[PDB]
Subunit: 88 residues, 4 copies
């Protein structure tokens, strides 16, 4: 019950911050809060476990708006970088 | 450029070691953007950045007991209070 | 080019409807419009191909808010229905 | 109720034929709601009903040529105009 009280106080006190925590800090705070109060997520969110598909979308979405030419140019530079690093 | 792209795309198959995950992501993203262009549909949720972030954040803590998660929240909250002030 | 013109006219004329088409009609209209102008969807949207996971979420989400008792009661009636239909 | 649920859940494993998809969905949804309760997280996108509907609608037409999709759009549009009026 000591922990419960300290949790209740921490949760309200973090509302008083004089500056906004960065994204990763807000994620850690949120994750812990839910896990503490709710426990494990209780359903497999479709796709969320599709790590390959998510990675491809994220990777490709990052390049949204790059023209054909600029994406082609960049691919070559990246490929050359990996070839230099690892060898062929 | 086209010829250099075709050669680079084939040559990268010859690598003597597997690039790390971030390296493969950058290569894949550029390859698709080059050959295909913009993704042509809004993938449901994928643009739901708030919802995605919450799921990732919370999924990372899968398996922590109530007590450990409670204890850790308090430490994190106190950590943020020390860092930013109240 | 005859088809293109008829498409352009149909697409603008459907805006003039005196009543809103039902959901399935709007879906068919939208699907055809995109397929005509854009072609195939060009990325696998994570999860969207996870048909098992999507079906479970949809099935369970439909029951959101049912109390334990009412969901338990209903499960039994449903199970009894399937047992009567198919046999055991 | 609990006992009747436990018996029903086991007995439905004994079915002599596989229920259709909608039947399995209803059974599954009720089972989870009974044992687990409400889904405890908003699954990204799943609540994006507009985006989901668009993807489903468009995915259904995967593989139609430009011409066939164009021709069919016109027929559908004319169909809706005849039905609802303009
Ligand atoms: O703030 P915000 O950006 O407006 O976020 P929301 O309005 O979506 O709600 C805040 C979320 O953080 C959670 N939260 C509330 N107080 C919190 C706290 N003190 N510490 C960590 N997380 C907290 C809420 O439960 C909510 O989660 P939910 O979406 O699973 O219900
Ligand atoms: O390779 P793999 O990871 O073993 O096979 P995967 O099915 O996971 O996908 C490979 C991806 O890399 C892409 N790809 C193929 N050659 C590539 C190359 N030389 N450089 C970067 N990406 C390439 C493919 O298009 C495919 O993407 P897609 O499925 O979206 O079309
Ligand atoms: O109308 P609405 O409910 O506001 O829908 P939106 O604002 O999201 O846009 C309408 C969609 O229908 C499409 N659309 C536009 N005109 C259309 C038409 N005449 N027939 C069928 N679909 C059409 C648009 O391209 C848009 O698709 P998108 O989301 O892939 O870009
Ligand atoms: O059965 P199966 O389709 O071969 O196995 P699956 O992995 O696809 O899932 C079976 C699901 O039915 C559920 N289930 C188990 N027994 C059940 C029953 N008697 N009635 C309804 N649902 C049941 C399981 O909990 C599981 O759901 P979950 O993965 O979300 O926890
Ligand atoms: C990552 C999803 C949203 C994050 C939700 C964080 C919970 C709110 C509590 C921390 C508030 C700190 C802001 C004070 C300024
Ligand atoms: C996220 C999707 C990844 C797509 C990857 C495209 C393939 C690029 C080449 C991979 C590196 C070549 C493998 C050699 C490793 C051995 O050694
Ligand atoms: C299913 C996603 C949204 C549907 C988009 C439909 C495209 C709009 C054209 C039809 C408008 C008919 C409404 C007139 C009243
Ligand atoms: C969508 C997820 C489905 C979950 C299904 C739960 C299992 C219920 C029992 C299935 C029917 C029993 C199989 C007997 C068929 C043979 O014959």
């Amino acid at each position: 019950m000591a922990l419960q009280a300290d949790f209740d106080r921490a949760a309200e006190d973090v509302r008083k911050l004089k500056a906004r925590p960065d994204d990763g800090e807000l994620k850690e705070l949120y994750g812990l809060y839910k896990q503490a109060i709710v426990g494990d997520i209780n359903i497999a969110c479709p796709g969320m476990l599709d790590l390959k598909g998510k990675a491809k979308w994220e990777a490709w979405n990052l390049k949204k708006g790059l023209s054909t030419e600029d994406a082609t140019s960049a691919y070559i530079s990246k490929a050359k970088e990996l070839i230099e690093k690892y060898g062929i």
